[PDB]
Structures are given as C-alpha cells and as structure tokens.
C-alpha cells in the first residue's frame, strides 16, 4: 500500500529534523563565538562590559532570529505540511 | 639589574608580544640611565 500521506509525513519529519539540526548548529556556534569575543573584551577591560553588551546583543539577535525562523518553518513543516493531500 | 618586587599598587596590550618589547627596551633603558649619569656628571663638573 504505502499510504501516500505516510510518505508525506516521513519526508516532512526528516525535513524538520534537518531544519532544526542546521538551526541548532548555527545558533550554538554563533553564540559561542560572540560570547568568546565578549569574554575576551571584558577580560581586557573591566568597565567595557556596559558598551560591549550592545554589539553582543546585536549579534545574538541576528543569530537567534535566524534560528527561530528555522524553528517557525519546522513547525510549518511538521504541523501544516505543504503539498499534503 | 636585580629585579625588585614591590608588593602592589585594565592590563596593557603588547604588540607583538611583551618579550620582544622587553628585549628591545632594556638596552634603551640602560642607554637612558647612562645618559642621565653623563648629564649628572656634567652638572657636577660645572
């Protein structure tokens, strides 16, 4: 038989897995690198923290927004699957 | 130059590295001290 909807769901689940895996890798690595920069900057300068948080927040936002877009589209994939009949 | 350790009182950044700067600076410090001695002796001579 191989009900078509079963194949659709399997493909959607694998696609969501890929979306989330890539999003997690990107978010983790980017946040780690930005935090590395922040920690080094604060280590060099005690009071730098106040002004360094601003660019660090910009970077964290730019990375986390990309990750959460992938989150939303995975939710789309596994809950409202395009092309499902 | 015996190293004198005074107890205590944003760290500096050193380009390229502190070791090279120290190596290039010690001879300059010795020359500066010799110059100070020469000036001091000139004043004493006058």
Swiss-Prot record, chain B:
Compartment list: Cell membrane
Which domain of life, per UniProt? Bacteria
Assembly and binders: F-type ATPases have 2 components, CF(1) - the catalytic core - and CF(0) - the membrane proton channel. CF(1) has five subunits: alpha(3), beta(3), gamma(1), delta(1), epsilon(1). CF(0) has three main subunits: a, b and c.
Question: What is known about what this protein does?
Answer: Produces ATP from ADP in the presence of a proton gradient across the membrane. The gamma chain is believed to be important in regulating ATPase activity and the flow of protons through the CF(0) complex.
Family to which this protein belongs: Belongs to the ATPase gamma chain family.
Which protein are we looking at? ATP synthase gamma chain
- The scientific name of the source species is Mycolicibacterium smegmatis (strain ATCC 700084 / mc(2)155) (Mycobacterium smegmatis)
The range of the complete sequence contained here reads 206 to 256 of 307
């Amino acid at each position: 038989d191989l009900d078509p909807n079963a194949i659709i769901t399997a493909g959607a689940l694998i696609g969501g897995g890929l979306i989330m895996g890539g999003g997690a890798i990107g978010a983790g690595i980017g946040d780690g690198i930005a935090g590395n920069a922040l920690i080094s900057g604060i280590a060099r300068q005690p009071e730098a923290q106040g002004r360094l948080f601003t660019p660090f927040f910009i970077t964290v936002g730019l990375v986390e927004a990309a990750y959460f877009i992938n989150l939303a589209f995975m939710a789309l994939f596994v809950f409202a699957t395009p092309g499902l009949q | 130059m015996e190293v004198e350790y005074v107890g205590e009182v944003t760290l500096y950044s050193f380009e390229p590295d502190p070791e090279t700067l120290f190596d290039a600076l010690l001879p300059r410090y010795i020359a500066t001290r010799v110059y100070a001695a020469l000036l001091e002796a000139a004043a004493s001579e006058s």
